[PDB]
Design a protein around this ligand. Structure first.
Ligand SMILES: Nc1nc2c(ncn2[C@@H]2O[C@H](COP(=O)(O)OP(=O)(O)OP(=O)(O)O)[C@@H](O)[C@H]2O)c(=O)[nH]1
Ligand SMILES: Nc1nc2c(ncn2[C@@H]2O[C@H](COP(=O)(O)OP(=O)(O)OP(=O)(O)O)[C@@H](O)[C@H]2O)c(=O)[nH]1
Ligand SMILES: Nc1nc2c(ncn2[C@@H]2O[C@H](COP(=O)(O)OP(=O)(O)O)[C@@H](O)[C@H]2O)c(=O)[nH]1
Ligand SMILES: Nc1nc2c(ncn2[C@@H]2O[C@H](COP(=O)(O)OP(=O)(O)O)[C@@H](O)[C@H]2O)c(=O)[nH]1
Lengths: 121, 434, 428, 434, 428
């Protein structure tokens, strides 16, 4: 049923090709938005910042998904303030939830966002 | 002394002020006969006092009926005004713009424009002036649009605010509300600095639920609009915490000179038994002021994105409960975006508690919120008009009674055209890319 | 006798007077009525700084409270302390500023600038020897952000030797006031850097964190907010205004700090506690030093852990040694050695003042420098430029007399600052 | 502040709460008008207080009749609730699942779901929420199963407890209790975290012997279920000795996500003259709580083997008399085995003495026990349903009045199928070998 | 000055404070108000251990009371002794732990761990020289069993020289609390053995035997239960905290005990009597030694007669010789010579402390080692593995973030322990 940290961390290292040491960098993000571009392909990657370890500034980067959830319509509330704390109790069941979205919506093909964002330049 | 004057044209503009000045007299301890008193600067704010101690409400009244105006001198405020300021008209042809504009209402103007003049000859600190009319009126739509266009021709840089009221999406009061309302947004486009408009059927929709009265009247709708007035004006007439001037709105609501149609959201509006069994804290109010149940204008501000919004708070308010609330609105999905202001707010704090008139069924509260919201959706009632008004003009229905009163249809040719740029302006702001 | 004449601007720029002036009277033993009531003889020999002597002991505060709108000006007039300031120096216009910068900088202050300078000139040459001028205002508003800057550039064009030192308060990262608060911040920094030496940056939201995180009050008000950040205006002159063992001055606190003409750094207090948290400690310098380390006791909404300390000055008052600071500064400079700047070994400045404040046995005032004050301006700059892409609210400035490309210049002025702090974050 | 909210759907869910909140108001010194007081955190547990001092019971009421709901505003608790929270329905077609689910009850949901929302906007420490309905209801079975399936769709990980009541082995209240009850265990299977169910005819069986009243009523059965509620909830609302959270149950009762139907056993329930001439020590109670005379559900828990059972004690309790008692139950033949937990218990201690309401004939006691027992026998009332429900469906009896309200019989095709896996699950746990 | 900072975790893990701290105050002559009231001058020279000095004699207990749910935390706050602890160190979360291990270890403590370590760090470097840390918690629950272990492994990853010593309480053989109490016990031992040195194991049911068998009270409560096992936390520091003739420390009580990194051993008291059983004896060391022999005066629910004594340390206080112990230890080591381990001749450690406790002329504290502490873990292991066969209650752990085979590892971790104690039961 559910998945631990043990499988999921290299699982999210796979489909994003990121050097994700611990899951709490999804406390910022950079991978949850890189879940959806593996399906929807329309996400404007130049709308998010890349370094942005500055939580007061980061709150711009949560809402960029709220256009993505708008145009495809999945009704989950996103409360970014404890999400942006880079702390657990929300980030797991936000990524346990986004692999409940893993169920049917893949076309199977790869989606190289490492090549899409200009090699993270 | 940072003072401003409020004109009243149209039968709406009559009865609106009859709630506004009632609130004004109760918000300073003014007896209804003008002879008051059964802050320091407060005791002489809207009022050019005489040494007798009674004082003139700095207003004017414009109507071409003697009907509703003479109800005041019959009514209990018979000593409040003075019979120069209260200029009537002996005859009328209302619901007729282009003779209320171009034939019959123009004969009052030179009498009106003199009374604007001497009241501007005492108010040393002048902050523009305030305009009340309706769109459902003929002459208030008629003379009102004519009223601005010479005053802003005179006064140049001075401030021009107006609280309007437009014909509903569902219930009209007259058939001319396509015709002799939608053209008046021509002259008031480039003569009103900012403007505000509100719906009856939306305000009635509040009355059946938040006021819970099956059969309300105009007067209760008059009282509800009236506190929005004193939430803006008398806030600078009271020594608050972060003071908000009249001039701050017109520079904190428009990125562009056309886009000056915000919303109104006033809250808490709470019935008698509803205030009991309830604590309305400040974030309990602000979570209601973004929900459509306290919404003044029957539109869809949920769907559109918000642009920029100033807020005004009355009573006992801390800014920490503001920032704890307002950081939750910007987090929440029910707004999505501004692109052109990454903040999109203006916060203002005045200490004066919300005034509670005795007669109506509104209930007393120790904190208040007024909301002026610019959005990417408010042009749909304008698009309601374009669905309506272009259909009437697809038959040419009493163009004669726009012609025979003295104006060709070239402005009706211009009518949807300026409306089309208004629709074009919101999709222009709707452009949100790189 | 090394004295200061005081300048405020803006609504909350005038609100800080009462937290300042009632403390500095209480710090000097002085009542509401102005007439003298002091205990020790210690509080006189440098009393002349913030006060002009008077007839009958009145001891007028040398100040000029300046504003564009008479809303909040009467509030401290008609309230208490209405007999401290002399009303000749109370000036204020009537027409609103609309908190728009060039309306407050360029044109409406020019209605009042002619009355400004004839006030401060006769105040200046009646002083013995000016030590400097204080400007306290806002970055976000219009009156304090605009009118004081034009007020500043005339004074810096009159007294080029005299030091110009400014206090100001920041735009918030989240709890912002208005939407032109990006424009006012950029336009204010265009005059602060070019004219005056030093400016400090105080977030109200980080100030709101202080009573939230440290003192544990759910609902403070601004009369508690300015009351806290008052005492650093006391703290910067704490060294100065009555004797001690070592202490130096703000000009001596200017030349020691920065190796360039680029002067911004941080503010904090020590000690600090809650209501019931008072007696459960042992208040001392190791108690002082650790509330001189966290970002939680700072004011800037920026991380020193993201940054690097250029130079540090510490200002103690109370019975305090040096070795109690020495062994303790060495205890924290070693564990946090990468946090210092290796351009300078021992960028620590020690200054020990004598008497304690009210009901506290020790007190310390924090001055530490950073590289991460660019974290303000990067957070400002993209908050600025994104409201330039569509020329947001542009007609409320060019409709008043300023060219739009003059507004573009201050971006590079901000970017000229960051370009240096880009380096010393990681270089050398 | 570790707070939770209780919904009330169905005419059972009406009158159940009318005993539950009565107990709640007496267990904190709350006057019946809401304005109370003729522990520290205790005085604000179930209650989002206003500064007036009276406070809202954090509940909701859902019914499609205006009949029984308006008895409250006639009744003595007329100031307790508030007339937003108490949402009624103007018309009803009850005993009709698939229009109480799919036609008529769904029109209330958007009004209901808003009132869930704002009450979740003050309760900062939220522990899921509590659900009351019946199976003998139509709409409480109907809207209730619909109520969970969007809330658990919204709230995700949040707790979902429900105290249900099912149609007896011997006495029905309606013929639809095969039909419009046994399907509702579909939606409540995968939306209720844990659940609990109880029998009237078993609870009536207690009334003729342990209460010794020939002619009881619903109200006395309402009072008996109600203390089981406060034995679980208000135990964490009182500073006990070994505190028991709501979340502890749902992790100490299910080895597998389906098996969440425990028992209820409450004791001592002792009549007026019976408390005298008797000392009910703690092991005197626990030897009764495994005997079928205080048993809430008319089944055979003797025959089945027990699985895992949490216990809750109120009043003056030592753990030594627990362990002296509980080592005798595990020795005794009347239980035989668990295979999957060699301990099979959870012990919990709260100090608050058992509250004794004045009106009914229940007697006061200085110690209390609540029992939540999982077993290998409780599927027989389910097997009673399979004996019943598959017989009705062997004739297709008003399938039209399941069809004409807007649902095909594919769920009735699914009905016994999910029931068959429930029967298959207890024999799956009945597998006890190597 | 050889000092300890104190850590609790869990509900009953916080309940033990009052039995600890009111005794150690009374053992040091200290009131409820914190201010000093002591008779002799003997109780000061090592007072600095469990107390940070304060302003005005307050003498704060160096402690951090930690929990996940605010049920029982206010109980000692709102009860008496509400002015001993400083509330800055009182931290507690609000959401329930559900006493599930990885909910308490891995995720909800991670909401609170960031506030944990910044508390104990500033406590650590304000101490002179740390002697060690105490962790008192539960094995069975979730908060004390889970959150303290993650709390431990960060501290053992910060202070590798500083000794980590833990107290904990056992699952019962018969009187168990919950059904995941097998899982919590195994998962707790996976961190205790790997990180900290020593842990002791106290059965509540064997503790319930003590007042049943020895003191003869039918109905004690937990405030008598912790009150008894309090004094061994007094007893282990009895040698240390005020002078004597010989005494050593817990690190010296660490290296003497075990010949391997595998540290668990027993706890008992001496003397002990009932109400009316008080005066009918002659309280002395032969009275002390025989209540240092039975399993009835032990705490572990395991038989030393099934086991074998590895090493023994004895901690006396009172007027006591050596030869009164020497002739008496020799009188019992001879009749029970097969009960000792023949790897070590004379595994006895003697330590004599000076002053007596309250109203008792002598007192002794028992430390004896065993082979039969595997009788816990064998009783645990098949209690563990039988609830793995059907993956009992597995979704309340893997539904939170931990791999199921990580749970299988701790079985062998338990079996790695037993594999050694398999040998030294009968080998050599
Ligand atoms: N007096 C009044 N009018 C209202 C109110 N609310 C809405 N209205 C509108 O105000 C309009 C009143 O103007 P008229 O109906 O034309 O009455 P009038 O005297 O002919 O007004 P003029 O055309 O300006 O002369 C109506 O169309 C209504 O739609 C209200 O509360 N009071
Ligand atoms: N009110 C009430 N109902 C009970 C009680 N005990 C059992 N019930 C059952 O609760 C059911 C009540 O729901 P309904 O009979 O359908 O009344 P209703 O208003 O139509 O309820 P809905 O179908 O939910 O609308 C009955 O069938 C009874 O079997 C009780 O003590 N009080
Ligand atoms: N110093 C201080 N500033 C505040 C406080 N509250 C708000 N502010 C900021 O102070 C400014 C208040 O605006 P205002 O004084 O009218 O700007 P002005 O046009 O220069 O007068 C805004 O930028 C606010 O962000 C406060 O309590 N103290
Ligand atoms: N030390 C001690 N432990 C107890 C007592 N009573 C019960 N316990 C055990 O302590 C634990 C109490 O559970 P709890 O503290 O809630 O576990 P938590 O999740 O870590 O807080 C259980 O494992 C009980 O078996 C007591 O009086 N003293």
């Amino acid at each position: 049923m559910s998945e631990s940290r043990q499988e999921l961390l290299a699982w999210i290292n796979q489909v994003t090709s990121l050097g994700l040491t611990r899951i709490e960098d999804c406390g910022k993000g950079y991978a949850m938005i890189q879940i959806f571009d593996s399906i929807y392909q329309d996400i404007p990657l130049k709308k998010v910042n890349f370094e942005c370890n500055n939580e007061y500034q980061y709150i711009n980067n949560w809402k960029v998904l709220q256009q993505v959830f708008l145009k495809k319509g999945i009704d989950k509330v996103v409360d970014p303030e404890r999400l942006s704390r880079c702390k657990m109790q929300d980030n797991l069941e936000f990524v346990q939830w986004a692999k409940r979205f893993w169920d049917q919506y893949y076309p199977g093909g790869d989606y190289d966002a490492l090549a899409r964002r200009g090699n993270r330049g | 002394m940072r003072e401003v004057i409020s004109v009243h044209v149209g039968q709406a503009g009559v009865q609106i002020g009859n709630a506004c000045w009632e609130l004004y007299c109760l918000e300073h301890g003014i007896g209804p006969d003008g002879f008051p008193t059964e802050l320091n600067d407060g005791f002489g704010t809207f009022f050019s006092e005489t040494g007798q101690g009674k004082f003139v409400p700095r207003s004017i009244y414009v109507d071409l009926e003697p009907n509703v105006i003479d109800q005041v001198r019959t009514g209990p405020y018979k000593d409040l005004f003075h019979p120069e300021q209260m200029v009537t008209g002996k005859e009328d042809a209302s619901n007729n713009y282009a003779r209320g504009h171009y034939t019959v209402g123009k004969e009052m103007i030179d009498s009106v424009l003199e009374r604007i003049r001497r009241m501007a000859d005492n108010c040393s600190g002048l902050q523009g002036f305030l305009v009340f009319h309706s769109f459902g009126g003929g002459t208030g739509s008629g003379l009102g649009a004519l009223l601005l266009e010479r005053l802003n021709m005179e006064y140049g840089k001075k401030s021009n605010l107006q609280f309007s009221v437009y014909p509903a999406p569902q219930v009209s009061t007259s058939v001319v509300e396509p015709y002799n309302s939608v053209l008046t947004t021509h002259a008031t486009l480039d003569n009103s600095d900012c403007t505000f408009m509100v719906d009856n059927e939306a305000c009635y929709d509040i009355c059946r639920r938040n006021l819970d009265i099956e059969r309300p009247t105009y007067e209760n709708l008059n009282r509800l609009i009236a506190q929005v007035v004193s939430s803006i004006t008398a806030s600078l007439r009271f020594a608050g915490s972060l003071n908000v001037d009249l001039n701050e709105f017109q520079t904190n609501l428009v990125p562009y000179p056309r886009i000056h149609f915000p919303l109104v959201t006033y809250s808490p509006i709470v019935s008698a038994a509803k205030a009991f069994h309830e604590s309305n804290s400040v974030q309990e109010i602000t979570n209601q002021c973004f929900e459509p149940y306290n919404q003044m204008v029957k539109c869809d501000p949920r769907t559109g994105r918000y642009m920029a919004t100033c807020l005004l708070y009355r009573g006992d308010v801390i800014p920490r409960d503001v920032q704890a609330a307002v950081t939750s609105i910007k987090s929440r999905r029910t707004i999505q975006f501004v692109d052109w202001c990454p903040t999109g707010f203006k916060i203002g704090i005045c200490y004066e508690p919300p005034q509670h008139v005795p007669g109506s069924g509104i209930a007393k509260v120790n904190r208040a919120v007024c909301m002026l919201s610019n959005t990417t959706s408010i042009a749909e009632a304008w698009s309601r008009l374009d669905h309506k008004f272009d259909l009437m003009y697809s038959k040419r229905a009493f163009v004669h009674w726009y012609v025979g009163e003295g104006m060709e249809e070239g402005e009706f040719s211009e009518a949807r055209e300026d409306l089309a740029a208004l629709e074009r302006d919101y999709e222009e702001v709707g452009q949100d890319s790189m | 006798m090394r004295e200061i004449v005081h300048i405020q601007a803006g609504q909350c720029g005038n609100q800080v007077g009462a937290a300042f002036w009632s403390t500095i009277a209480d710090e000097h033993g002085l009542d509401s009525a102005g007439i003298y009531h002091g205990t020790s003889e210690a509080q006189h020999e440098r009393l002349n700084v913030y006060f002009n002597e008077a007839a009958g002991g009145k001891y007028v505060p040398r100040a000029v409270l300046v504003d564009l709108e008479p809303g909040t000006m009467d509030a401290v007039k008609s309230g208490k302390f209405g007999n401290l300031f002399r009303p000749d120096n109370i000036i204020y216009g009537q027409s609103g500023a609309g908190n728009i910068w060039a309306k407050g900088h360029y044109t409406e202050g020019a209605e009042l600038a002619d009355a400004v300078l004839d006030v401060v000139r006769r105040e200046a040459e009646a002083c013995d020897a000016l030590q400097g001028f204080q400007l306290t205002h806002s970055l976000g508003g219009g009156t304090g952000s605009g009118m004081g800057t034009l007020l500043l550039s005339k004074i810096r064009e009159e007294y080029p030797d005299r030091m110009m030192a400014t206090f100001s308060v920041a735009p918030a990262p989240k709890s912002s006031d208005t939407v032109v608060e990006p424009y006012n911040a950029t336009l204010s920094m265009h005059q602060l850097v070019e004219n005056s030496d030093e400016t400090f940056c105080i977030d109200n939201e980080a100030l709101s964190s202080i009573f939230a995180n440290t003192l544990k009050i759910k609902s403070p008000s601004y009369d508690d907010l300015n009351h806290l950040v008052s005492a650093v205006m006391a703290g910067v002159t704490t060294s100065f205004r009555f004797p001690g063992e070592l202490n130096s001055d703000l000009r001596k606190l200017a030349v020691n700090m920065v190796p360039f003409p680029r002067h911004f750094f941080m503010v904090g207090f020590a000690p600090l506690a809650a209501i019931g948290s008072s007696s459960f400690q042992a208040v001392s310098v190791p108690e002082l030093t650790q509330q001189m380390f966290d970002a939680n006791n700072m004011m800037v909404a920026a991380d020193p852990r993201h940054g690097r300390y250029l130079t540090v000055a510490a200002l103690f008052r109370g019975k305090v040694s040096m070795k109690e600071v020495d062994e303790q500064i060495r205890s924290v400079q070693t564990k946090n050695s990468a946090y210092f700047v290796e351009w300078i070994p021992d960028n620590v400045l020690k200054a020990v003042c004598s008497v304690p404040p009210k009901d506290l046995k020790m007190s310390a005032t924090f001055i530490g420098n950073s590289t991460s004050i660019q974290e303000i301006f990067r957070r400002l700059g993209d908050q600025f430029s994104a409201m330039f892409r569509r020329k947001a609210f542009l007609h409320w400035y060019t409709g008043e007399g300023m060219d739009e490309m003059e507004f573009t210049e201050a971006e590079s002025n901000m970017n000229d600052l960051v370009s240096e702090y880009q380096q010393y974050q990681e270089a050398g």
